[PDB]
Design a protein around this nucleic acid. Structure first.
Lengths: 115, 103, 159, 43, 171
RNA sequence: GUAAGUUUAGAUUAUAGCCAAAAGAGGGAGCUCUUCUGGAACGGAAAAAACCUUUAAUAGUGAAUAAUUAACAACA
C-alpha cells in the first residue's frame, strides 16, 4: 500500500477534527472482531497488544512502534484520540475518574446529568 | 388540542412537562359514552341454556347418532369434528389431578 | 398560475401530510395549568391503588400494594427488615401518572419493602453435548434466592 | 428457609390486584355512533 | 376495572365479527389483513394457545381486482393423487368456475401451516355478493375500510374538477 | 510491544488426515500432483464436518450488537 494513504490532507483533518500540530498522544483501541480463521501473524499481534477481549478499552501511546503495530491490526480495531478537557487526574481524584464514549476522561464525577 | 392522540374513545390525555422539566405528567380521566350514542334496552318483553338446548335439537331417530351429534356440535361452535372425539384411558389417567391456579 | 407553481397531485405531495405544531408560548401556559391541577390532585390525595416501576439488579419490577417479588440472589439483609428501593422510574395513580427522565426525584417518590425469606433455587440440570455422553456427566445449579414483600409507596406534592 | 416447598416457580411475582385502570377488552378504543347504531343499520 | 373475574374473562376472551368488502380490492392485500383478523393478531394480548381468532366476513368477492395480468398469468396447481391427476388452472378460469375459490385459496396459503388453520377457515365467511344473513349482521361488530383506495373513472370525475384541471396544451 | 528462552541429564508418545482458498508444475476440458494459508456453532448461508459472524462457561420473565437468498424491451 502506498504511503500516501497515511499522509493526511487538509480536508481529512477537518473531517476527523485532528490538528496537524500538537498531535494526540494516546490511542483508544477496542477489538470488534474475532481472530479465528486469520493468519498466525495477525493472531500474534492481537495477543501482544492485549486486545484478547472484544470491546476492551486499552491505553496506548501514539509512537511509531505502536503506530506500526496498530497499522497491522487496523481493520480489527477502532482508533479514537484521547481528550483531557480537565487535564491529567490527580492522586486524590484517581478514584473519581470516568472515561466517556466521546473520548473525554473527566477527573471529577459529580453524579449530575449532563442534560 | 395539545394532546397528539384523540381523547374521545378511551380517556382524555393531558400531557405536561413539569416546571423543573425532570418529569412528564399524564392526566387520564376516563370518558363515558354519550347517552345519545347508546342504544336502549330491548323494549319487547328466555335463558341461554334453553337456546343452547334448542340449537342442539333432537329431531331424527330420537337421539341422533354420534357422528351427526358431533357434526351438530361442530356446526354450533364452528369447530372440527376431530376435536369432539374421545381419548383412550392411557392419556386420561395421565392428566394432572391438581393443576395450580394463580390469579 | 405563478412561476414554479405545482398543483397538488398523487406524486406532487408525499403520502404523509405535513402538520403544524402549536405555538410554544401558549403551549407553555398549558404545561403550567396541567401541573397546577396535578399538584392539587396530589395534595388532595385523590388516588387509591398505585403502581410503581422500580429497577432492581438487572431487572425492572412493576410494583403494587401486597406484591411479592423474588430476587434470585442473596441480599445480606435479615428477614423482616424494611428496605427502601432507590431506583423508581414510573409511578401511577387513579387518573394521573409520573414519568422519570429517566428517573424521578428522590423527594417525590419513596418506596419501601421488607425481606421475607432467604432461599435457594430448585436444582437445575446442566449437561454439555459430547460424543459418548455417559450418565455421570451431570451438574446441578442451586443458586441462592431471596423473597421481598412490598410494604408502602409514598408520594408528596413536591412539583 | 421456610417450610414452603422447593420446586420450580412459574411466576416470580404475586399480586392480588394486577389491574388498576381496568383490563383491556375488545370494546376498548372502539368509537361509538349516534343512537348506538350497529354497522350497516339503515334505521 | 372493578368488574367481576368471570365477566372480565368472558369479555377479554370474546370473539369479534368483522365485515370486509372485496369489490375492486386485491385479494392479496385483503388476505394479509384477513389473516391478522382471523388468527386474532389484532388483539394486544394475542397468544398462540389462547384461540383468540375472530370471525371475518368477506363480500363482493366476485368483483375483486388483480394487478397486472395476474388474471391470465397466475395458475393454480392441484393434484388429485391419481396417475395423471395433475391439474393446472389459470386465475381467470378459476374465478369463472367459482368467484370465492380464489379468495379462500389465498387466505388458506397465507394462514399458518398448522392444525389451527382448519378451525380458522370455519370462522371465515365468504360471500360472492353483498347478500348476508341478518343474524350475521347482528353478530358483526365492525366493518373494516377497504385496503386499496379505488381510483375514479373519467365519468366519476366531477364537473368542477374538470374546470379546475388546466389544459396543458391546445389542440 | 511483551515473558519466556539457552544449556545439561532422563524419557517416551505422535510421525496416515478431510475440505476450503492461494502459488506452481504436468494439461488444453477438467483433472493429477508439489508448496503456502484456514477451518471443526449451540448463529447464518434451506437441511449444510471443511464457507461467513463468533474468545471460555454460570443463573436471571434484562440490554446493545455481528454474520445473515435474495435482486429490481433500447436510440439517438
Amino acid at each position: 500500500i502506498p504511503d500516501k494513504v497515511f499522509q493526511p490532507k487538509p480536508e481529512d483533518h477537518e473531517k476527523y477534527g485532528g490538528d496537524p500540530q500538537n498531535p494526540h498522544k494516546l490511542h483508544i483501541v477496542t477489538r470488534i472482531r474475532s481472530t479465528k480463521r486469520r493468519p498466525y501473524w495477525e493472531k500474534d499481534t492481537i495477543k501482544m497488544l492485549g486486545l484478547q477481549k472484544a470491546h476492551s478499552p486499552q491505553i496506548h501511546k501514539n509512537i511509531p512502534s505502536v503506530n506500526a503495530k496498530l497499522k497491522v491490526v487496523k481493520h480489527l480495531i477502532r482508533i479514537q484520540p484521547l481528550k483531557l478537557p480537565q487535564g491529567l487526574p490527580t492522586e486524590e481524584t484517581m478514584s473519581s475518574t470516568c472515561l466517556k464514549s466521546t473520548g473525554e476522561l473527566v477527573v471529577q464525577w459529580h453524579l449530575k446529568p449532563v442534560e | 388540542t395539545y394532546s397528539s392522540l384523540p381523547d374521545d374513545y378511551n380517556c382524555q390525555v393531558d400531557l405536561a412537562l413539569t416546571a423543573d422539566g425532570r418529569t412528564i405528567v399524564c392526566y387520564h380521566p376516563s370518558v363515558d359514552i354519550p347517552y345519545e350514542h347508546t342504544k336502549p334496552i330491548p323494549q319487547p318483553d328466555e335463558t341461554h341454556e334453553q337456546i343452547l338446548k334448542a340449537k342442539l335439537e333432537v329431531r331424527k331417530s330420537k337421539q341422533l347418532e354420534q357422528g351427526p351429534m358431533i357434526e351438530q356440535l361442530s356446526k354450533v361452535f364452528y369447530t372440527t369434528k376431530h376435536r369432539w372425539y374421545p381419548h383412550g384411558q392411557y392419556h386420561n389417567r395421565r392428566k394432572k389431578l391438581n393443576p395450580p391456579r394463580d390469579r | 398560475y405563478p412561476q414554479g407553481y405545482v398543483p397538488k397531485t398523487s406524486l406532487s405531495s408525499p403520502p404523509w401530510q405535513e402538520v403544524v405544531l402549536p405555538d410554544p408560548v401558549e403551549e407553555t401556559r398549558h404545561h403550567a395549568e396541567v401541573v397546577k391541577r396535578v399538584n392539587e390532585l396530589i395534595a388532595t390525595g385523590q388516588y387509591g391503588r398505585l403502581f410503581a416501576v422500580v429497577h432492581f439488579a438487572s431487572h425492572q419490577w412493576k410494583v403494587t400494594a401486597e406484591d411479592l417479588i423474588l430476587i434470585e440472589n442473596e441480599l445480606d439483609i435479615k428477614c423482616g427488615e424494611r428496605i427502601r428501593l432507590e431506583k423508581v422510574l414510573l409511578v401511577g395513580a387513579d387518573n394521573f401518572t409520573l414519568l422519570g427522565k429517566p428517573l424521578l426525584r428522590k423527594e417525590l417518590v419513596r418506596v419501601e419493602a421488607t425481606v421475607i425469606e432467604k432461599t435457594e433455587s430448585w436444582p437445575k440440570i446442566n449437561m454439555k453435548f459430547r460424543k459418548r455422553k455417559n450418565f455421570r456427566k451431570k451438574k446441578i445449579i442451586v443458586n441462592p434466592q431471596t423473597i421481598l414483600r412490598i410494604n408502602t409507596i409514598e408520594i408528596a406534592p413536591r412539583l | 428457609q421456610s417450610g414452603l416447598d422447593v420446586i420450580r416457580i412459574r411466576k416470580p411475582f404475586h399480586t392480588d390486584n394486577p389491574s388498576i385502570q381496568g383490563q383491556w377488552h375488545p370494546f376498548t378504543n372502539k368509537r361509538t355512533a349516534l343512537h348506538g347504531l350497529r354497522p350497516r343499520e339503515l334505521r | 376495572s372493578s368488574f367481576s373475574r368471570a365477566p372480565q374473562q368472558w369479555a377479554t376472551f370474546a370473539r369479534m365479527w368483522y365485515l370486509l368488502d372485496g369489490k375492486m380490492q386485491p385479494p392479496g392485500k385483503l388476505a394479509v389483513i384477513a389473516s391478522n383478523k382471523l388468527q386474532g393478531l389484532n388483539k394486544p394480548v394475542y397468544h398462540q394457545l389462547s384461540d383468540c381468532g375472530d370471525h371475518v366476513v368477506i363480500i363482493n368477492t366476485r368483483h375483486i381486482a388483480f394487478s397486472g395480468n395476474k388474471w391470465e398469468q397466475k395458475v393454480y396447481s392441484s393434484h388429485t393423487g391419481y396417475p395423471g391427476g395433475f391439474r393446472q388452472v389459470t386465475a381467470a378460469q378459476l374465478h369463472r368456475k367459482d368467484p370465492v375459490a380464489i379468495v379462500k385459496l389465498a387466505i388458506y396459503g397465507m394462514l399458518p401451516k398448522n392444525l389451527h388453520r382448519r378451525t380458522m377457515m370455519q370462522r371465515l365467511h365468504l360471500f360472492p355478493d353483498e347478500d348476508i344473513p341478518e343474524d350475521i349482521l347482528k353478530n358483526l361488530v365492525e366493518e373494516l375500510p377497504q385496503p386499496r383506495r379505488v381510483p375514479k373513472r373519467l365519468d366519476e370525475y366531477t364537473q368542477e374538477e374538470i374546470e379546475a384541471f388546466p389544459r396543458v396544451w391546445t389542440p
